[PDB]
Design a protein around this ligand. Structure first.
Ligand SMILES: [Zn+2]
Length: 287
């Protein structure tokens, strides 16, 4: 019967984050479920308040979760957030690990816009992956949320817009599976790299798997990733997936991406395919 001070009662683990897990909670005053993150005050490098600050900086963005509370309570730093629905990875497993083209296109449109909004607030995410996208609840069930800013970094000064310097010899941050080729090569991440990851995530949803899945290990993924041409990766799928990836890989370090061009590629394909823009996802057509 664990209680976060007076206000919240703790429940089962419901998520795994870059720094700590997410637990199911109840807000005692609301009669309401919430998501809770905990960090021991003795932690060597505390980051919970740091990550909460980014969220709050993003607040009011479409598809950004809201923070109910951040503070110290007892021997913990605590972060309480609005509870969201299943991740795209979860829903992918319920859909037999294959999404229809219509689902992938509806998802791409939202996912490019979340990344675009984050970049507009001067941050890069750096762990773009299916588990960090969650569907909303109730009336927001048709909205894709982006979560987890623990690996997120500022890429430009807010007032001056001075972009962070080019560096190399970096250790990989984020999941090796969706990492950009330049990330595997040790280059400092930038805007281009969040968009390149998203492309691997979209092809993952079309294919059910990537060619560098299921094979020292990091050199081996990097090899296979660098050995597999985009044309080969995207064979049998609309040309827009390859075009998306080619453009991302063309981008120079500090370049601003053309988010509208990438979204339009997919919107045009959507028109040609004859799909209704009805936000009816593959999982909604499940029993
Ligand atoms: Zn705080």
């Amino acid at each position: 019967e664990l209680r976060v001070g007076n206000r919240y009662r703790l429940g089962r683990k419901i998520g795994s984050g870059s720094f700590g897990d997410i637990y199911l909670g109840t807000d005692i005053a609301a009669g309401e479920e919430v998501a809770i993150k905990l960090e021991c005050v003795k932690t060597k490098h505390p980051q919970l308040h740091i990550e909460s600050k980014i969220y709050k900086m993003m607040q009011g963005g479409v598809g950004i979760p809201t923070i109910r509370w951040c503070g110290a309570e007892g021997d913990y730093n605590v972060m309480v957030m609005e509870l969201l629905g299943p991740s795209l990875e979860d829903l992918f497993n319920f859909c037999s690990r294959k999404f229809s083209l219509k689902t992938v296109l509806l998802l791409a449109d939202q996912m490019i816009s979340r990344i675009e909004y984050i970049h507009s607030k001067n941050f890069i995410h750096r762990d773009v992956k299916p588990d960090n996208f969650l569907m909303g609840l109730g009336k927001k069930g048709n909205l894709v949320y982006i979560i987890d800013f623990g690996l997120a970094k500022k890429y430009r000064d807010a007032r001056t817009h001075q972009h962070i310097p080019y560096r190399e010899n970096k250790n990989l941050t984020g999941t090796a599976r969706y990492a950009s080729i330049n990330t595997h090569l040790g280059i400092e991440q930038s805007r281009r790299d969040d968009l390149e990851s998203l492309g691997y995530v979209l092809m993952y949803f079309n294919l059910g798997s990537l060619p560098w899945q299921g094979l020292q290990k990091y050199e081996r993924i990097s090899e296979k990733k660098m050995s597999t041409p985009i044309e080969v990766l995207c064979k049998g799928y609309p040309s827009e997936f390859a075009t998306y990836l080619n453009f991302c890989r063309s981008l120079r370090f500090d370049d601003k991406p053309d988010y509208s061009y990438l979204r339009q590629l997919f919107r045009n394909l959507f028109h040609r395919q004859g799909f209704s823009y009805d936000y009816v996802f593959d999982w909604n057509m499940l029993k």
